[PDB]
Amino acid sequence: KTATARAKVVDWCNELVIASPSTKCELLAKVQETVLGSCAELAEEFLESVLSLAHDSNMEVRKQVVAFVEQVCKVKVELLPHVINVVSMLLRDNSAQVIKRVIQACGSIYKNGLQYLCSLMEPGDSAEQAWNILSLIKAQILDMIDNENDGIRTNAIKFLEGVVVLQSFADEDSLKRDGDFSLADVPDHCTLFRREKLQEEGNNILDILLQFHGTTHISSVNLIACTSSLCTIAKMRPIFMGAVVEAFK
Amino acid sequence: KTATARAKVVDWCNELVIASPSTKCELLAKVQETVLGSCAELAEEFLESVLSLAHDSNMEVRKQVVAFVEQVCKVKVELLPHVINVVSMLLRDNSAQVIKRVIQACGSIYKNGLQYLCSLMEPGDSAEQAWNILSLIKAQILDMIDNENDGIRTNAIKFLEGVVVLQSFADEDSLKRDGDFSLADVPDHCTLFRREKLQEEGNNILDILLQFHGTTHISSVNLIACTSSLCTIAKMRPIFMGAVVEAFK
């Protein structure tokens, strides 16, 4: 039933308060399975209790909260506003492993977020506020290709790749991929932001990638990832193929 | 029932003999839907009648036979031996559009073929014979990166990318992809061919790609495709990352 599913979550949450890191990770997984699956109507009630562990001192625990937040945005995107702040602050984490994980989660979070927010007719102030945190997140990650952790850069590159593809127009020559989404898919009525500003932002993110590509001390891992994303961009959005080929030569 | 499904196929096939190109394409689609889906036990009976159109003078018709053959190898791989010759001969087609399509179909055909043949215990002479036609096909496509049709080269590059990834060992650092398959997945008992020969062949195909990458007159489209496949190879099989980065610089 529902009262019994909720009763277990309450017990699981109360144990989170006193559990070991390892067990906290296990209880988060269980709570997620229930409030974001089996009994999804329970999600909002326990959001607070879960988001609280974003402050835990153990990084594995924090990475677990990241997984929970990414899930929230795949299946309960209405709650994106209530979890999007954790995303942004965890991008300022002290652990690189946590940041690399957050950057990864942002790929789907930003995409799902964009698809949701731009679909709302006359979005409220919570929607608008959330859209701003997303804009801030894009900036936070953009600055990270200059981070000193190689892995953080690799992830940032990939994340930026998807924003470019999202914030651009797919033409009749765009490589075909099933999940593709572009500025062309944005409803005409939407007024939360508007095509050209994102298109310009996308163009600029590309400039940074093209630029980063030719930096003398780019790591071999960062070169592959950057080269790869550039090719993907050039294939998904041909309009950029000129600039990409120029960078390659 | 089965007699009625088969009766319609017979009528559809008899019309193929006298239909227009456009209608031939339509009847092939219908026959495929039935003999490779709704009533898959009918496939072997009508294989001959279908493979016959591989000789049609209209190229759209031939491309339709290509689609049929690729399907056969996805769902009735036992029949790969009976259709694999059409694949090889159509790679010698006069139409580039036909060849580009065949090359594409070979991606799944070779993969499905490899997965099937190497799974058989004490494979028969038909299996062995088929494995040879596959080896011949790999060679036919390998020579095509030097073809004068830009598009044929683009496709050949991609096809070769998958052979390299297939004919190599995935380690604990290989980028994760759900369908991945490597020489490590080949049964220990298999004696149709053996790991090192494919591994060597894979290494050589890579040499050709790395080499082609730096040719002075590589087209921008061919550069992107080649650069892209190299990155993919380097990510899927790290052991090659050194050589790929070297090529990029």
CB atoms within 10 A of CB A189: 10
- Cβ of residue B223 closer than 8 Å to a chain A Cβ: yes
A221, A224, A234 member nearest B224 (Cβ): A234
Contact B142, B205 (CB under 8 A): yes
Contacts of A232 in chain B (CB under 8 A): 228
Which residues, including other chains, have CB under 8 Å from residue B42's CB and lie 6 or more apart?
A: B2, B5, B6, B9, B34, B35
Residues 6+ apart with CB under 8 A from A245: A234, B220, B223, B224
| Rounded Cα gap, residues A116 and A220, in angstroms | 37
DSSP for chain B reads -HHHHHHHHHHHHHHHTT--HHHHHHHHHHHHHIIIIITGGGHHHHHHHHHGGGG-S-HHHHHHHHHHHHHHHHH-GGGHHHHHHHHHHHTT-S-HHHHHHHHHHHHHHHHHHHHHHTTSSS--HHHHHHHHHHHHHHHHHHHGGGSS-HHHHHHHHHHHHHHHHHTS---TTSPP-TT---GGGS-SS--SS-HHHHHHHHHHHHHHHHHHHT-TT--HHHHHHHHHHHHHHHHH-GGGHHHHHHHH-
Q: Is B232 on the interface with A (CB under 8 A)?
A: yes
* CATH number assigned to the domain covering A1-249: 1.25.10.10
| Pair B166, B229: CB distance under 8 Å | no
- Residues in chain B with CB shorter than 8 Å from the CB of A241 are 220-221, 224
Sketch the domain layout of chain A as residue ranges. 1-249
Would you tell me how many other CB atoms lie within 10 Å of the CB of residue A86?
A: 22
Rounded Cα distance, A168 and B28, in Å: 39
Whether A244 and chain B come into contact, CB under 8 Å, resolves to yes
Q: Which residue in the set B223, B224, B245 is minimally distant from A223, CB to CB?
A: B245
Can you say how many angstroms the Cα of residue B125 is from the centroid of all Cα atoms in its chain?
A: 21
Interatomic CA distance for residues B116 and B75, integer angstroms: 11
**B190 inside 8 A of chain A by CB:** no
How far is B175 from B232, CA to CA, in rounded Å? Answer: 9
Q: Which residue of A has its CA nearest to B245?
A: A220
Contact A220 B228 (CB under 8 A): no
**Alpha carbon of B247: minimum distance to chain A alpha carbons (Å):** 11
Structure-token pair, residue A36: 């974001």
**Residue B125 · residue B197 · CB < 8 Å:** no
**Residues A19, A58: Cα–Cα separation, whole Å:** 12
Q: Which of A224, A245, A248 sits opposite B241 (nearest CB)?
A: A224
Give the distance from CA A141 to its chain's centroid.
10
B224 to chain A, any CB pair closer than 8 A? The answer is: yes
Distance between CA atoms of residues B56 and B9, nearest Å: 19
Residue of B nearest to A229 (CA): B228
- Phi, psi of A19, deg, nearest 5: -70, 170
Alpha carbons within 13 angstroms on the beta-carbon side of residue B43 total 22
Distances (CA, A) of B167 to A131, A247, B109, B153: 46, 31, 15, 21
Q: Which two tokens stand for residue A200?
A: 């310009």
Burial class (CB in 10 A: 0-12, 13-18, 19+), A178: exposed
Task: Name B59's Cβ contacts closer than 8 Å, sequence gap at least 6.
Answer: B93, B95, B97, B98
User: How far is it, in rounded angstroms, from Cα A6 to Cα A34?
Assistant: 8
In this structure, are residues B231 and A228 in contact, taking their beta carbons and an 8 Å threshold? yes
- Closest CA of chain B from A245, distance in Å: 6
Q: Which residue of A has its CA nearest to B217?
A: A249
Enumerate residues 6+ apart whose C-beta is below 8 A from B237. B164, B165, B168, B169, B170, B171, B174, B182
Interface test with B, best of A223, A236, A239, A244 (most B CBs within 10 A): A223
Count H helices, E strands: chain A? 11, 0
Resolution in A: 2.4
Q: Rounded to whole angstroms, what are the CA distances from B139 to A114, B83, B169, B229?
A: 46, 18, 21, 18
Q: Residue holding tokens 């997303």?
A: A134
Residue A23: CB atoms within 10 A of its CB come to 13
Contact A241 B248 (CB under 8 A): no
Q: Cα separation of B34 and B7, whole Å?
A: 11
Whether B248 has its CB under 8 Å from any CB of chain A: the answer is yes
User: Cα–Cα distance between A71 and A198 in angstroms, integer?
Assistant: 25
Identify how the structure was determined.
X-ray
Report DSSP state, residue A37.
I
Amino acid at A36: L
Partners of B235 on chain A (C-beta within 8 Å) are: 224, 228
The shortest C-alpha distance from A206 to chain B (Å) reads 16
Burial class (CB in 10 A: 0-12, 13-18, 19+), A79: middle
Name the nearest CA neighbour of A247 among B215, B233, B229, B224: B224
Q: Are B43 and B36 in contact (CB under 8 A)?
A: yes
User: Which among A208, A78, A188, A191 has a CA at the least distance from the CA of A139?
Assistant: A208
CA quadruple B20, B24, B27, B32: dihedral, nearest 10? 180
The pair of structure tokens assigned to B123 is 């494979």
Give the number of other Cβ atoms within 10 Å of residue A198's Cβ: 20
Question: Which DSSP symbol is given to A179?
Answer: T
